[PDB]
Ligand binder design. Structure first.
Ligand code: 9UE
Ligand code: 9UE
Ligand code: 9UE
Ligand code: ADP
Ligand code: ADP
Ligand code: MG
Ligand code: MG
Lengths: 372, 766, 372, 189
């Protein structure tokens, strides 16, 4: 028997593996770098595009670009490069022997998955293919059939409610505000201390600062007030070349823009209001079982103290007799991939692939019939 | 047997000629036999790859319904595809001739079954002119009796005799004594396919003349060294246990009508990289293990030896082999050394040298921040004693060796500057010293043996017996296999040239035009592999010289520059470490891992001069004759350049004389006589380029027959011009041809024979 | 096969040899001398220009001139004389049979190498030619692909950083302050003891004094102070004719003008600041690997105690957690030539020569395309 | 600094701090902006009417060619001087595209140049042609380059400070005495 390949490619990292395991085999960032200087020594690799983890060790020489933004692919040649590197160099398994389970976000344009299908069936020659939705696999991986999933990664933040296996497509909500916007907002508000990060290879240093030092405050105004009385809020960080920088308020002002998008000039609602407005579009009978299973997912939900803030902020909006219960598993950064592997390793699922004959006789539009 | 051989053999199989017997315009069959690969016995017997089926009368054109008969596994008809059906040979007998290029349908199962049939009745020799195939029967066929020698020598007719090694021996003696031209016998096969037996039989045929004897002191002297040779020049691989890692050559000068006057032994292409590092499942040369295990107490106390698992040059995870005892062979090699006029002092010196090599292989080097450098080399204090020992057992000066390993002296315009090596270069120099000492000791032993049977008039016209190996067609390939494949490409070029010349001569003798015989050449792959400037080896050297060179850069530079021609191709999976070359026998894949570490070897003139001034005379004789050259960078001393030089010398030596070819084959692995394993034999048919020779015959007119056999075979096709009994054979044959309906582009009528294309003979059958 | 000729001609000496060796064959000064007196004995050589080592044994009769100053050729007839003497009399090998690898400094005018090419292809008839840069060959000869090279010879002091084979042309720095200025400064400050050297043939005596007696002090002020308490600083030197001179402070005040150019009336930064300002123009990611490989080259870097002073002076400018590592090989006077020979003896390089057909069809400007 | 660097290709070496002023004056006198960079670089190798002469303080004469339109071109292609950034024509368009779709038509109509580095000859035409290529086809790009745009900031400051509504926005001394230097973060935008 042959196993399937599970490839969950978001706007940031790429998670890839074989169906059956309980963790992705290869995780690497989805960037393509190109050299901006001329090479002068003879006998060196005259490569013209570095992909993945190699374009990250020598980022000081290259210009880095992401081919996916807001969940939508803006450059298809770079995406083909990423997929080629993923199949042949990372997994080391030709795609012409295994079926592939890809992943997309809800409320995306249709040309996206149509072109994805055309590329999978024409450039590579896969025997079968399928395109799932991330917030559903994140629930597969949890042992539940009822709950609302709040998935937040690098490009998109979306909520999807599900009641006993039935999808409620009129209550799906999408919000273009994720980790990349928080990186840019931190890079902007760091100017107030005299630190200027501008290049594309300095965005990675800011991202690492954000991952290491930022947290979420339970009460924003009280926290902003008690930080002007002392200096135990400040932390230090050492740059790659040896300098030392110090951060204060910026530790809890950067992620706060998830709950108040107007900080970064957007007219939208926070993740605590988008979640409550998505429950209130469901029938009055099923609202008590959604308040009990609020599942966090993605990587941007990994700040310290986000469950407490989310619970306290939804409890204030819901009636007084409900029991709010936020579920934050410790490995929620790979929930989509684990759910995809579980799903693709089922016997009932083996009748839902999009085989090659159907594509040959019906064209790329077939994905709109067979895939939800 | 394992499954990897099954996969390889199944990947070798081809498919070309289509099936037939729907003649003429219906669906009638004549009890037609085919070869197929789908059968219940095939998925059960690993030693079977094809079965002979008979298509049932009434089958359809789209799908074939057949019942197998060979072997008779069942009688129930089943269905197979027309693409899994190869033709067969039913109107032919494998014992009516020896040549194979005469068969009507030549493919993999046809030739396999032909060889199997001839072999099962103790007929092990076969001919693929001018090739001679042989098989190891694991017993004695009674062909070593002087009766056979006299039968094949004295009988003025030999060309109408069964094929035998004595055919080549007699042709060689004839062409040697008739015209003053030297001859060369090339025995190319695996290290278990019985090559030593063929060599011994050829030498015995050579020994017996009309005044010559049976045994000669040359024979017993040469056989008094095979223990030594196989102890120093053989190692345990993963697909063998007594593999020969060098080319052995013997020059024999024989009188006009006497025996064997003098002889000399020459070694070529010894693999030096094995002395330093071996794979995880192999060992180094035997002498290390057998000397370390079999040495008596006085040596183990005097030299200071330790256990096998306590040395750096020896792979610790694989030291034991079951078929070898590793003890009694030590006494065997000691006795073989005593038999060649060596006192006890010489044995003590030689084993002290080997122990010193093993000891020096254990010294460790560290880095220092001194001399203005960041990584100046230095010997670790803990081994400062060990080092001294390694210099006593070689009879060398420790201080001068330290000076030549850790110090670099540059002479500018007119001044001496005293630098210092880093750690990597110091380790390279130490390893180079070890490998050079080993190889020079081996060559000195060979010279001391040759000293007894030396000719004094020199070799002006002699006899040659080269013992070489074949391709390496597995999936885990490295630098050594690359060198082997290069050697075999050179040999293939030589073979094709000889064959084309002989066939042009033959066509000229039988009164046929020779403006139509065109053979393919393998000069493109040789240019891709060994040209200067643009080849794999040149870029490997570049990466060995350039700053900060790696294997990935080497693969990338090859892929970028050799992209002009289609003989180089990068792999698909992990394409930054593997590549593929389109040899003449098909594509082979290499893994460019640890190429640089195995190609670096630097020996400087200062060290040679330090060695030549040793107090011991044997060490003084070790490096003598070798000229030095100091004040240069290492651009001609790396392993690739040494290999190319030795290959050039050997190919010159061969191109001087006239060659003859012999191929040895082993039928199975359990050594039991009269067996068969079609995968393991198809692999060796592929490696030795036998199928390539067959494909080469099928250009021009491969079906050459005299009028007698031609009429004997085609007496039923034409009656109107066969039993006239009033005209010459050429006339009746040309009448049969003009009646058959073959155009001039399919036949030729020779002055004493008839010549037919492959398509011609495929037509004339029906 | 034919070998190439490697000719590294600086402002002082000339290093020449054949590609493949590990040291230059002929090293001789690049001067042209002319007699200033009339010859009176009959039967003697009535030569009118002495070149190289001959113009140095009989310098008491001649006027010596250098045809190269600050890396730029100021007199082309004398340069043709030097090249003729180098090819035919020193190497004894006609140039019409070998390719030639020449060498130039960075940030030079273009007419320089254009005229060099025209002369090589028209006056002599070389089959091929190439023009390299000295600070790159000095790194070829070291077994590294990453580092910053500080090359200081007789006319120019320049720094060139390189990261894994990629050149950073916006961080190349040049400084017109080298050995000749130190010779002139010593000749000037020797007047304070009563020694007057004025002629061109007395500049060589001052140069020899400088090479024999001068060194670099670790701490300039402490050294200047502890030299007024004793007289063990003083050394003696015997002139060609038998007199004895004595030098004191001038032993460590002459080379100190490498770190404080204002001593000799220049407005510039020392070699320790020019090196640090050249690292600080590189990206923050690659600065840690340049601090670890600072390669000294040229002849003016051969003073006693220059590595210690350079390390102590750069450590004070860099952050506290970096590891400064200055590399001073003992044969750093011929690093450029060794690197040039290594480079020209490569198989990948044989496609980069400027052949004669390209020059015949494109003119002398071709060097601006093929040579970096 | 970029002009001082690329002048080495003709043999002129300016190094000291007092020679930077001479280079600045050369730049102000002789440099201009080309409408199409590649066409200009190509048509300058066919003739020598591009070259100009300049007399140094002490009497020497230097001549400049390509460097007249290669120095300011680094405003539109910063990679010339080793920076990873976008030109002034992309930074301007990327700043309009961060505004709401309703107010983008009124920004395309008023692009105001200011400062002294915007005084090269032919910068309005290049900027208009380069933004027109990035904006939709139906918009009306309109770059406004007043002739005294070198002192616009000062004139605007005087106008502002001479208003009656403004006299309530000063940071008086009592507020500083009672609140410290941080007061500027409240009262000043
Ligand atoms: C932050 C980094 C190093 C730092 C120098 C590490 C050290 C430790 O921090 C300081 O020394 C603080 C100091 C400073 C601090 C307080 C102050 O009242 C004035 C200056 N800031 C500066 O000198 C600014 C000046 C500046 C440039 Br130009 N444009 C800018 C745009 C916005 C804001 C400020 C600026 N400066 C040189 C930088 O940002 C440079 C470009 N930054 C980097 O290369 C990054 C990759 C690493
Ligand atoms: C240095 C040399 C020899 C030396 C005579 C070797 C001996 C050993 O030193 C002395 O005797 C020191 C003595 C002296 C010392 C102390 C003092 O308070 C006064 C004089 N100095 C002198 O007599 C000066 C006077 C002088 C002339 Br005129 N113009 C000059 C320009 C600047 C400075 C001084 C002068 N003097 C004759 C020279 O320099 C001559 C031209 N120098 C040479 O030919 C060189 C090639 C070799
Ligand atoms: C430019 C100026 C005067 C000029 C002499 C005015 C005249 C009119 O131009 C020439 O004569 C061109 C000529 C020259 C032209 C073409 C050529 O193939 C070689 C030389 N150039 C030279 O002689 C160079 C040599 C040079 C020194 Br040293 N380091 C340098 C660094 C980089 C480049 C070149 C050099 N030279 C003396 C200078 O730059 C001096 C330092 N420059 C000045 O003092 C400035 C303040 C004024
Ligand atoms: N410990 C952490 N704290 C805060 N943010 C994190 C942390 N780890 C990862 N992130 C953020 O997660 C984002 C990527 O999350 P992930 O969901 O794995 O990728 P994708 O969005 O492509 O699925 C990054 O932008 C990064 O900023
Ligand atoms: N031992 C030394 N100490 C100090 N300076 C030296 C020494 N040897 C040579 N020099 C200086 O080196 C300069 C020439 O160096 P070199 O690099 O060989 O020539 P070029 O600059 O032409 O390449 C001379 O001016 C000389 O003053
Ligand atoms: Mg995701
Ligand atoms: Mg130099």
């Amino acid at each position: 028997d042959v196993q399937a390949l599970v490839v969950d490619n978001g706007s940031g990292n790429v998670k890839a593996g074989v169906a059956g395991d309980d963790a992705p085999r290869s995780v690497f960032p989805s960037i393509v770098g190109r050299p901006k200087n001329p090479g002068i020594m003879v006998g060196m690799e005259e490569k013209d595009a570095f992909v993945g983890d190699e374009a990250q060790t020598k980022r000081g020489i290259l210009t880095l670009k992401y081919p996916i933004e807001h969940g939508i692919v803006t450059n298809w040649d770079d995406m083909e490069k990423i997929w080629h590197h993923t199949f042949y160099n990372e997994l080391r398994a030709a795609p012409e022997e295994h079926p592939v389970l890809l992943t997309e976000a809800p409320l995306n344009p249709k040309g996206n998955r149509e072109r994805m299908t055309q590329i999978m069936f024409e450039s590579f020659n896969v025997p079968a293919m399928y395109v799932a939705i991330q917030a559903v696999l994140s629930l597969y991986s949890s042992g539940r059939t009822t709950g609302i999933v709040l998935d937040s990664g690098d490009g998109v933040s979306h909520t999807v409610p599900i009641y006993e296996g039935y999808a409620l497509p009129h209550a799906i909500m999408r919000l273009d505000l994720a980790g990349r916007d928080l990186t840019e907002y931190l890079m902007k508000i760091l100017h107030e201390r005299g630190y200027g990060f501008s290049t594309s290879a300095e965005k990675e240093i800011v991202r690492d600062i954000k991952e290491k030092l930022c947290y979420i405050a339970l009460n924003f105004d009280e926290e902003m007030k008690t930080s002007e009385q002392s200096s135990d809020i400040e932390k230090s960080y050492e740059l790659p070349d040896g300098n030392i920088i110090t951060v204060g308020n910026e530790r809890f002002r950067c992620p706060e823009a998830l709950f108040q998008p107007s900080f970064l000039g957007k007219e939208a609602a926070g993740i605590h209001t988008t979640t409550f407005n998505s429950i209130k579009k469901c029938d009055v009978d099923i609202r008590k079982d959604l308040y009990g299973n609020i599942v966090l997912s993605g990587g941007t939900t990994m700040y310290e103290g986000i469950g407490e803030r989310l619970t306290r902020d939804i409890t204030t909006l819901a009636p007084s007799t409900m029991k709010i219960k936020v579920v934050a598993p410790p490995e929620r950064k790979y929930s989509v991939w684990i759910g995809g592997s579980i799903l693709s390793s089922l016997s009932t699922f083996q009748q839902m692939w999009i085989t090659k004959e159907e594509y040959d006789e019906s064209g790329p539009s077939i994905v709109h019939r067979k895939c939800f | 047997v394992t499954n990897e051989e099954i996969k390889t053999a199944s990947k070798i199989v081809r498919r070309v000629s289509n099936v037939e017997a729907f003649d003429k315009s219906g669906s009638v069959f004549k009890g037609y036999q085919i070869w197929t690969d789908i059968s219940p016995t095939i998925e059960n017997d690993p030693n079977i790859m094809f079965v002979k089926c008979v298509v049932q009368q009434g089958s359809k054109k789209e799908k074939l319904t057949v019942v197998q008969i060979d072997p008779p596994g069942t009688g129930t008809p089943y269905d197979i595809d027309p693409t899994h059906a190869w033709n067969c040979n039913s109107q032919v007998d494998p014992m009516s001739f020896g040549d194979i290029g005469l068969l009507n349908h030549t493919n993999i199962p046809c030739v396999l079954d032909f060889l199997k049939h001839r072999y099962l009745k103790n007929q092990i020799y076969t001919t693929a002119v001018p090739l001679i195939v042989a098989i190891n029967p694991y017993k004695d066929l009674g062909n070593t009796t002087n009766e056979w020698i006299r039968r094949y020598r004295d009988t003025a007719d030999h060309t109408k005799l069964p094929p035998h090694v004595f055919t080549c021996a007699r042709e060689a003696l004839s062409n040697l004594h008739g015209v003053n031209k030297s001859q060369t016998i090339i025995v190319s096969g695996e290290s278990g396919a019985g090559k030593t037996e063929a060599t011994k039989q050829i030498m015995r045929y050579f020994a017996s003349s009309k005044s010559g004897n049976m045994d000669l002191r040359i024979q017993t002297a040469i056989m008094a060294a095979n223990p030594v040779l196989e102890a120093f020049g053989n190692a345990k691989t993963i697909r063998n246990n007594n593999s020969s890692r060098f080319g052995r050559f013997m020059q024999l000068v024989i009188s006009h009508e006497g025996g064997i006057r003098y002889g000399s032994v020459v070694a070529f292409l010894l693999e030096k990289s094995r002395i330093i590092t071996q794979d995880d499942n192999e060992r180094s040369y035997h002498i290390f293990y057998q000397f370390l295990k079999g040495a008596n107490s006085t040596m183990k106390s005097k030299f200071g030896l330790k256990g096998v698992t306590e040395y750096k040059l020896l792979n610790p995870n694989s030291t034991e082999v079951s078929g070898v005892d590793d003890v009694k062979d030590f006494e065997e090699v000691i006795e073989s050394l005593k038999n060649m006029e060596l006192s006890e002092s010489d044995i003590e010196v030689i084993f002290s040298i080997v122990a010193g090599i093993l000891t020096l292989g254990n010294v460790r080097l560290i880095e220092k921040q001194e001399a203005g450098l960041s990584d100046a080399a230095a010997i670790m204090d803990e081994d400062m004693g060990v080092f001294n020992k390694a210099c006593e057992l070689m009879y060398l000066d420790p201080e001068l060796i330290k000076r030549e390993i850790l110090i670099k002296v540059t002479v500018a315009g007119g001044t001496k500057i005293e630098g210092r090596w880093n750690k990597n270069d110091a380790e390279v120099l130490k390893s180079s010293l070890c490998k050079a000492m080993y190889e020079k000791l081996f060559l000195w032993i060979i010279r001391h043996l040759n000293s007894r049977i030396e000719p004094e008039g020199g070799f002006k016209t002699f006899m040659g017996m080269l013992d070489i190996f074949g391709f390496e067609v597995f999936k885990n390939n490295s630098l050594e296999q690359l060198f082997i494949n290069i050697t075999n490409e050179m040999l293939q070029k030589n073979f094709v040239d000889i064959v084309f010349e002989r066939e042009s001569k033959l066509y000229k003798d039988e009164g046929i035009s020779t403006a139509e015989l065109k053979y393919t050449s393998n000069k493109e792959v040789i240019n891709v592999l060994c040209e200067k400037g643009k080849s794999v080896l040149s870029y490997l050297e570049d990466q060995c010289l350039a700053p900060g060179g790696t294997d990935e850069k080497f693969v990338s530079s090859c892929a970028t520059n050799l992209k002009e021609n289609n003989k180089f191709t990068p792999a698909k999976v992990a394409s930054n470490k593997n590549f593929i070359i389109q040899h003449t026998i098909g594509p082979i894949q290499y893994c460019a891992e640890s190429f640089l570490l195995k190609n670096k070897d630097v020996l400087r003139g200062d060290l040679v001069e330090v060695i030549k001034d040793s107090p011991n005379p044997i060490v003084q004789q070790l490096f003598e004759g070798q000229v030095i050259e100091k004040g240069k960078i290492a651009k001609g001393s790396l392993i690739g350049s040494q290999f190319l030089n030795q290959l050039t010398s050997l190919m010159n030596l061969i191109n001087s004389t006239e060659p003859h070819f012999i191929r040895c084959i082993k039928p199975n692995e359990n050594k039991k006589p009269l067996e068969w394993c079609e995968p393991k034999i198809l692999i060796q048919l592929h490696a030795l380029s036998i199928l390539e020779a067959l494909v080469l015959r099928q250009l021009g007119y491969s079906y050459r027959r005299t009028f007698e056999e031609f009429l004997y075979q085609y007496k039923f096709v034409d009656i109107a011009a066969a039993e006239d009994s009033s005209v010459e054979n050429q006339n009746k044959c040309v009448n049969i041809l003009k009646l058959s309906g073959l155009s001039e582009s399919m036949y030729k009528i020779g002055k004493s024979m008839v010549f037919l294309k492959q398509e011609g003979a495929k037509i004339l059958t029906k």
